From a paper:
SET8 (also named PR-SET7, SETD8, or KMT5A) is a histone methyltransferase that is solely responsible for H4K20 monomethylation in cells. Intriguingly, SET8 primarily promotes H4K20 monomethylation in the nucleosome, although it also possesses the ability to methylate the nucleosome-free H4K20 residue. Mutational analyses revealed that the interaction between the SET8 arginine anchor and the nucleosomal acidic patch plays an essential role in the H4K20 monomethylation activity.
The nucleosome core particle (NCP) was reconstituted with recombinant human histones, H2A, H2B, H3.1, and H4, in the presence of the 145-base pair Widom 601 DNA. The SET8–NCP complex was then purified by sedimentation in the presence of paraformaldehyde (GraFix), and visualized by cryo-EM. The cryo-EM structure of the SET8–NCP complex was then determined at 3.15 Å resolution. Surprisingly, the overall structure of the SET8–NCP complex is different from the structures previously predicted from the low resolution X-ray diffraction data. Unexpectedly, the SET8 interaction with nucleosomal DNA was not obvious, although the EM map of the SET8 region near the nucleosomal DNA is ambiguous. The SET8 Arg188 and Arg192 residues are separately captured by two acidic pockets, formed with the H2A Glu56 and H2B Glu113 residues and the H2A Glu61 and Glu92 residues, respectively. Intriguingly, in both the SET8–NCP and SET8–NCPCENP-A complexes, the H4 N-terminal tail adopts the outward configuration and is incorporated within the peptide-binding cleft of the SET domain. The present structure differs substantially from the crystal structure model, in which SET8 binds nucleosomal DNA.
Numbering used by the authors:
A (entry chain B): 22 to 102
B (entry chain F): 16 to 102
C (entry chain K): 187 to 352
D (entry chain H): 33 to 124
E (entry chain D): 33 to 125
F (entry chain G): 10 to 118
G (entry chain C): 12 to 118
H (entry chain A): 38 to 134
Amino acid sequence: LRDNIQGITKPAIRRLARRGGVKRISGLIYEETRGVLKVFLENVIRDAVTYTEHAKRKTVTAMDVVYALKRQGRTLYGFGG
Amino acid sequence: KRHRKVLRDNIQGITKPAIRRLARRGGVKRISGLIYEETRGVLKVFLENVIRDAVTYTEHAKRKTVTAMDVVYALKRQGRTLYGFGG
Amino acid sequence: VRRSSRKSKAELQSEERKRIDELIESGKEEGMKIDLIDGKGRGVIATKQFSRGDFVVEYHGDLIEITDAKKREALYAQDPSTGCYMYYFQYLSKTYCVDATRETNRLGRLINHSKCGNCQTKLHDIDGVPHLILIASRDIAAGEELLYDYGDRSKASIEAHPWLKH
Amino acid sequence: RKESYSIYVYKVLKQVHPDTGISSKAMGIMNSFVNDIFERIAGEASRLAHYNKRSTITSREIQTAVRLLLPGELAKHAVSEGTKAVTKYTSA
Amino acid sequence: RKESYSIYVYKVLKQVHPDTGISSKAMGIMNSFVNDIFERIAGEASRLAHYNKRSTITSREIQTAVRLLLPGELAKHAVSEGTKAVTKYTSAK
Amino acid sequence: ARAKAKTRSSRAGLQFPVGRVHRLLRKGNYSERVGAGAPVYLAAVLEYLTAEILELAGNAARDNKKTRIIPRHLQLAIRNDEELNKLLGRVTIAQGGVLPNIQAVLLPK
Amino acid sequence: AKAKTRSSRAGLQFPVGRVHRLLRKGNYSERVGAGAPVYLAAVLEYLTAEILELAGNAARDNKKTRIIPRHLQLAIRNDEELNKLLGRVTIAQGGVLPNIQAVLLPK
Amino acid sequence: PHRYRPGTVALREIRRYQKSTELLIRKLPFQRLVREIAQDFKTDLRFQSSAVMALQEACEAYLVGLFEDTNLCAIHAKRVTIMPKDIQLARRIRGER
Amino acid sequence: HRYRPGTVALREIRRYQKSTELLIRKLPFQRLVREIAQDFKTDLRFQSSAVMALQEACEAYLVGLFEDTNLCAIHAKRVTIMPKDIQLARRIRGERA
DNA sequence: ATCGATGTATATATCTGACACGTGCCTGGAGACTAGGGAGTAATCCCCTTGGCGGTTAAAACGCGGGGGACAGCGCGTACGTGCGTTTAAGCGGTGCTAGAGCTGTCTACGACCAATTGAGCGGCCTCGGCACCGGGATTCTGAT
DNA sequence: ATCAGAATCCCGGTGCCGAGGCCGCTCAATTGGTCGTAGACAGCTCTAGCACCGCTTAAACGCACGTACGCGCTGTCCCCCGCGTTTTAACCGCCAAGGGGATTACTCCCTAGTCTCCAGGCACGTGTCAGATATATACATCGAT
């Protein structure tokens, strides 16, 4: 799995920005947003894999992700918990 | 000797030079003129929240004095953990 | 059938505001009689069980600017039988004066000064005009007198009136 | 034996909007909301009991936790509801 | 009679900076810091134990709580120190 | 176990399970003991909050001329209510979307 | 028989017994393993050793011998890890990091 | 041969994507990225479908809120276009590293 | 004789970032605290340590808010902080909807 | 400122999956009863909070002049939007496979509990030295020339 | 530059009060022994996560052109800053009272624990209807000739 952050394509980030209310989007926004997303995902997945490892499991579960997010301060309603 | 009648606020005790000292500590180089009323509003909101929570903790302990632990607990409730008052 | 009656904070604040306006312009003045005090002169005993924040009276008078405020008080004081009726207040870069020497049908101007009374005065602007409201900032019994602070620290007047500190 | 609040949220719904249903995803979301508010109130009541060196969580602790966690009007009305329920419960 | 971490903070101080004091205010601040980090780690370990439906906090739960609460290098070295301490504590008996 | 049993909920006039709330306050390690009115109070508060959210959600679903409350309607209710949005301000609602809101400086002239 | 504190068995300067008592009386779980307080005390000692070492470095760089809230503040806000850890923490009598934005310096 | 002024299509997309609720990132590329990032921390991990959907919902909500604040920053700078300096200001004020 | 406007500002900045004492004055701040608490429970009492804690917290709050405000202003190509900057900082931090 | 695409709300058909409902049962909730210990309540002491007085002086308030900094206008060029033809890879549905979650049973090591004891930690005391402070030589910044 | 000239840093020495060492007491940590139960480990089932493969087609991509906007520059005008004088009220010390915080002692009543009874909630299977398309109607919108 190499260079998958490019799977967050330019039109995808533009759709996210449209949902956010953005009207125009500088062209350097896309790499910045890919970096921001990779950082946020690294943090949440590190916490989720830690919860999983502690449960001696091997499947990251919806509850492991929900707990990671609740610990980041970003409680997520709709996947259990 | 007839005298006039005026008021005060106790929020104007956060004086303009004090707000400018705070801004200087924050690194502000130049200050607008409405920053003072804006900052007084901000500070009154923050104080209202923290003191409401501290007075709630006090009432629950059936005390009539607001100890420093009540303020520390209120601040931790807001998410602004304060070190150095017996926390 | 189960319906919440919550009245979001905007509704509560607006309703308190409208209540203030209609009460000020209602002239009800519930239960306040003029009597005598042992040394001060007149007295207005309120006969209702007040509590925190409830209304008491409106210090009805004439509102003016500051250029005439810093003058009219002394110009009425040139009459040594004027008492104390004018109220200044600083609000939005301007200080004002509540001309209340000319007698009115209201109960505002009829109160004396102290720092050990029961009232601390606020301000309300019913469409611009700042009406000097008086609220019960504490628990008052039916049979206590209206007594608030004039805020005035005129060292000359406090020299002549040592009773201003009390 | 999976624990949920689905049937009780159904009851409260059919009590508020008697001619309105609720999808399964919204059911899961209301379930999570109830779990989260329960966890908050219980953790805050625990903190209060520990602060005041008590051992029991009581209606006093739960009321103070409600007053700390919910903003103004929500807290006033929730305290009203809980006090009414406790008085009715101890009467019956 | 009220408990604190004053003498232990002072011992660790005399370990790291032998000729150096610490004022009363900084002593109170280190007290608050020790209490805060203790409460964080213990609450996270409690929450982990409740997650896995288990009743006992162990060195496993504490290690996971440390690896959750401290940022990368602090967490790595704190896990190192804790494991060292637990092995030395079980060797002797 | 005579004197035919009625649930603590029914005795309290609630729809949320007071017995389950008691069990959760016990097997949750919040405190050693747990008062008798604590589960009743907590269940009353939880049922109140649930009713308060579901009322606004049903109103939104009826505005959009629908019959089934959905995550979108929950999101709309919560974000539009001033105090539920403060209680649930750092909460993500799956498949909720955002509020329709365009800043004024982007509209045409 | 002769006794020696658990702290001495583990080589720690923090009280393993006090930590165990706190874990028990703090209502964290129905049971507390043997090595749980040892691990927790070791971690608390490591963290306070880090904080104290950096604060002592600050006190040296200030040519003083006592640590003070200001020195704790400097140590924390300068170390990136400790600043991420204690990021939502105010330190009484601690002041702020000396930092003037470049756009305000004289050109 | 009709054509709109630049901006009206953007406003229509705004109204559309604020009416809708569906996920705006492609599920399979997102899942692939998540599997990579996780592979960094622990090898041979499995993922529940609901776990990856939760990650996606959380990431999308994060980016949508970040873009709301970025748009506020841009409007503050008297612009209409959001820029990397706007994202960086939003994150720095908001507390992220 | 005279200093160019700005040099005394920077001198004050260096001075107040060197120091640690409280910048608001204790007696006015304490009067403010008492009047605010007067609206939640009458006849309250405050440990002097409690008022000092409140003052440390409030000054830390305002200092951090002014750092964020300065960042907003600098972002807007300005140097003078403004109420719109304070409002943007608060809104991005999540204190005012 | 109609034209005329161009897209958009209103209506009906309908149908597909999801939701609301009926059933049996088992497992958790309720009722009674007993024991004990946690907490309510009364008393007491002394700490520490509040209030007032007096003087100092440091700090706030006020006024003024002026300059630099915000803001509005303007021009330019560039980079972002919009649209269209093309490519590519997401998505959907099939199957199959097997890893690993989840539940069960056994049993042992481990942690709670309880009592005897002893030394580590705490509170009060006292001393000295570290930091503050006050005044002085130097040098290092700004600012008019 | 050219310079002075106020701030500012390095320097002594005094001084004072807080911090660090000392010691006696007491209470909580250690030790030893018992027990009961939690979880560790093995075993087995069987869901569901992964992999693959083919088709469809929706979405991504690349290109071209135009134009809206970002950004630099200029001018003005005004509103903060710096400074000097006055005033005011923070602050510090002192005293003096008294509320109420903290501790202790006692008693009672409320909650845990146990056992038994049983009904309500859960999985499970089924009927049906809400809402999501699909197409048509009428209309709204806006961009330009």
